[PDB]
Design a protein around this ligand. Structure first.
Ligand SMILES: *[C@@H]1O[C@H](CO)[C@@H](O[C@@H]2O[C@H](CO)[C@@H](O[C@@H]3O[C@H](CO[C@H]4O[C@H](CO)[C@@H](O)[C@H](O)[C@@H]4O[C@@H]4O[C@H](CO)[C@@H](O)[C@H](O)[C@H]4NC(C)=O)[C@@H](O)[C@H](O[C@H]4O[C@H](CO)[C@@H](O)[C@H](O)[C@@H]4O)[C@@H]3O)[C@H](O)[C@H]2NC(C)=O)[C@H](O)[C@H]1NC(C)=O
Ligand SMILES: *[C@@H]1O[C@H](CO)[C@@H](O[C@@H]2O[C@H](CO)[C@@H](O)[C@H](O)[C@H]2NC(C)=O)[C@H](O)[C@H]1NC(C)=O
Ligand SMILES: *[C@H]1O[C@H](CO)[C@@H](O[C@@H]2O[C@H](CO)[C@@H](O)[C@H](O)[C@H]2NC(C)=O)[C@H](O)[C@H]1NC(C)=O
Lengths: 339, 36
């Protein structure tokens, strides 16, 4: 029956495929994104798109339009977003989608209604003549949504901006099997073959959902959150890091997710705070998403007054893992200007 | 060692998943946990 698992495997395959582009960029830096924060921003944009440039977006997101009608992908998203913003009684998870439009704009009243309904989006009128005030007002939305975790999403806002599409996601949940703080003890982490970093390492000796796949050449750890979330860790055999990355595939994830068999083990894993702050333009480029970022761009779904194009696609995410759980937040920023 | 010791003391990949939908919330790679 349901729609989210009509789009899920497509999401998943996108993420990985996005990942591999980020990982091809630097081998030396932490990566952290929200594949959902990104992906939904480009689909409610795609509502406002036509022809080539529309097709690349949807296609670019690992959707195969012959096999699935356009109209169902958005019904799918409408479902995904409903289901994420349900009240898990123990876990707190929130997404939100916003439009910020210049006063002067007259929109295609359908496009507006579409985003309001399907992607439950919020619409604000601003004056992009007061660049610093508009910058402020956007960054507050994301601050208010991400509950203070993402504060400077938009650093450089363009003077001639006609609209901004912003979305957020906020996660805070607890382990089921939490770490006892008294055990967290500083050890070595071996970044590079020549770089060695001392880290506070959380420790438990217990019955974990762990296993090792010769396939992936990895260890695999599944950590439940209290509630309808789960964290999955993959520790590659020495030399097999890049292997691990290429082997990743949705269905392999689903296999793990059906296993609930516990092994006893001695588990040491770090406590974490990182971020990732990306200008996606070049990355999405390799994924075949160009034309929206060109003067070939059709956004006549949005407004008829002028030919728009997309100027900036800038995403940011922040991870914090400790002994009691994790709080993570991401946001996607898309700005559109005239030719 | 028994039970066997699984130390994440080197670059690992991870990701977060919503159960009902099995949709990929966040994905990450930790190369250095002091690089913020
Ligand atoms: C990201 O990806 C990278 C690969 O693209 C990974 O980094 C690479 O890792 C290897 C690890 O083996 C490094 O090599 C080490 O070099 C040490 C000696 O350094 C001098 O000589 C070597 C060649 O022998 C050279 O690579 C160095 O740059 C340096 O010499 C320079 O060489 C150039 C070319 O000749 C010359 O023009 C310069 O004048 C010269 N000098 C200077 C000052 O620049 C060795 O001692 C190390 O040996 C240990 O490790 C070996 C592998 O296990 C082992 O067999 C040995 O027994 C010993 O234990 C080692 O060989 C590479 O330099 C490094 N970079 C590149 C571009 O290849 C990286 O790990 C990865 N990061 C991730 C995944 O996080
Ligand atoms: C929709 O997906 C299918 C399956 O991946 C694509 O069709 C296959 O494409 C490869 C590469 O061109 C061919 O070698 C196969 O013969 C195709 N399978 C069949 C049964 O014809 C298809 O191309 C995708 N749709 C679009 C429009 O690209
Ligand atoms: C995670 O999501 C599930 C749904 O899969 C939540 O369960 C539903 O909760 C409501 C009450 O809020 C019930 O009336 C429904 O019958 C429940 N089940 C279904 C299948 O809809 C669940 O509460 C969530 N969180 C936890 C901690 O279980």
């Amino acid at each position: 029956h349901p729609t989210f698992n009509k789009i899920t495997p497509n999401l998943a395959e996108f993420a990985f495929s996005l990942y591999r582009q980020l990982a091809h960029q630097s081998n030396s830096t932490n990566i952290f994104f929200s594949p959902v924060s990104i992906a939904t921003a480009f689909a409610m944009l795609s509502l406002g798109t036509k022809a080539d440039t529309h097709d690349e977006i949807l296609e670019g997101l690992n959707f195969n339009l012959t096999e699935i009608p356009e109209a169902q992908i958005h019904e799918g998203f409408q479902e995904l977003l409903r289901t994420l913003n349900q009240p898990d009684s123990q876990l707190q998870l929130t997404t939100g989608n916003g439009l910020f439009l210049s006063e002067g704009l007259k929109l295609v009243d359908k496009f507006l209604e579409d985003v309001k309904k399907l992607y439950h989006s919020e619409a604000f009128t601003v004056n992009f003549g007061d660049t610093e005030e508009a910058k402020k007002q956007i960054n507050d939305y994301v601050e208010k949504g991400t509950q203070g975790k993402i504060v400077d999403l938009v650093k450089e806002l363009d003077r001639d901006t006609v609209f901004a599409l912003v979305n957020y996601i906020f996660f805070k949940g607890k382990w089921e099997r939490p770490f006892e703080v008294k055990d967290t003890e500083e050890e070595d982490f071996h970044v590079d073959q020549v770089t060695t970093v001392k880290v506070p390492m959380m420790k438990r000796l217990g019955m974990f959902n762990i296993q090792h796949c010769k396939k992936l050449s990895s260890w695999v750890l599944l950590m439940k959150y209290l509630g309808n979330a789960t964290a999955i860790f993959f520790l590659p055999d020495e030399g097999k890091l890049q292997h691990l990355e290429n082997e990743l595939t949705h269905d392999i994830i689903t296999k793990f997710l059906e296993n609930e068999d516990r092994r006893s083990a001695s588990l040491h894993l770090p406590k974490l705070s990182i971020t990732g702050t990306y200008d996606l333009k070049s990355v999405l480029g390799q994924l075949g998403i160009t034309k929206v970022f060109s003067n070939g761009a059709d956004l006549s779904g949005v407004t008829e007054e002028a030919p728009l194009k997309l100027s900036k696609a800038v995403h940011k995410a922040v991870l914090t893992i400790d002994e009691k759980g994790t709080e993570a937040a991401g946001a996607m920023f898309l700005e559109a200007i005239p030719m | 060692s028994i039970p066997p010791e699984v130390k994440f003391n080197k670059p690992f990949v991870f990701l977060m998943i919503e159960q009902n939908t099995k949709s990929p919330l966040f994905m990450g790679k930790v190369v250095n946990p002091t690089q913020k």
